[PDB]
Design a binder for this molecule. Structure first.
Ligand SMILES: *[C@@H]1O[C@H](CO)[C@@H](O)[C@H](O)[C@H]1NC(C)=O
Length: 235
């Protein structure tokens, strides 16, 4: 999918126009550039071993692959290699970079694709084949796992509602921190773009149940996390 990057396109249009004139006989120009353009488009034809390949990457994986490629391409052109050497070098590199990209896409699916273990992530994906950008909802369980927090008598109580995937999600609004009373009732304690809640130098009253919601425009919460806080009469 790496031809979806405007930079890759120009670097190709620079190889043809700036590099080929002084480093390959003109008989090979149209033919080899025909082959190069086709090779790079073929970055989207992937097999992937197992699991199967979906035809989507996130924008990071896409950038990642364009970088590998264009740094490699560039090494060649700083080298000033000509003729046959140049063609071999050029075509080894394309071959390696495809295989490399393949490993990006594989890693992307195993680890970056709908990476959330709970909640609902809005992931911006891109379709290899048409360079088209979509937003896809990864909907998982609402159970992020219960956070049991032990905090010493008079130290800070930090409640972190941040998940690693939150920074990669679309449509987030605010984190709202609730206090749950035992009444099966609650009070809004905090709300903003802060992912944490700190009641410093806490005390025995401050123990109990807390709750974090992460909102999304404009619908159901992206994340719910529950904390149970127990304060310890201790050092
Ligand atoms: C619910 O229980 C807590 C217990 O401390 C209390 O502070 C709160 O006022 C109760 N709810 C209402 C509506 O009073």
């Amino acid at each position: 999918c790496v031809i979806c990057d405007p930079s890759v396109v120009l670097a190709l249009k620079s190889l043809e126009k700036d590099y080929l004139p002084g480093h390959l006989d003109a008989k090979h120009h149209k033919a080899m550039m025909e082959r190069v353009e086709n090779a790079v488009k073929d970055f989207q034809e992937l097999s992937l071993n197992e699991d199967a390949y979906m035809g989507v990457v996130d924008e990071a994986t896409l950038q990642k692959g364009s970088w590998s490629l264009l740094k490699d391409l560039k090494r060649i052109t700083d080298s000033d290699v000509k003729g046959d050497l140049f063609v071999k070098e050029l075509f080894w590199m394309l071959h390696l970079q495809k295989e490399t990209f393949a490993t990006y896409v594989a890693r992307f699916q195993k680890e970056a694709y709908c990476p959330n273990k709970c909640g609902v992530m809005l992931q911006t994906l891109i379709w290899c084949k048409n360079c088209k950008k979509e937003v896809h909802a990864c909907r998982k369980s609402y159970d992020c796992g219960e956070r049991n927090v032990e905090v010493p008598q008079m130290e800070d109580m930090i409640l972190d509602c941040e998940l690693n995937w939150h920074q990669a999600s679309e449509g987030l609004t605010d984190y709202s921190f609730y206090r749950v009373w035992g009444n099966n009732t609650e009070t809004l304690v905090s709300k903003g773009k802060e992912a944490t809640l700190t009641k410093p130098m806490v005390g025995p009253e401050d123990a109990g149940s807390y709750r974090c919601e992460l909102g999304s425009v404009n619908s159901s919460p992206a994340t719910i996390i529950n904390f149970h806080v127990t304060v310890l009469p201790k050092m």
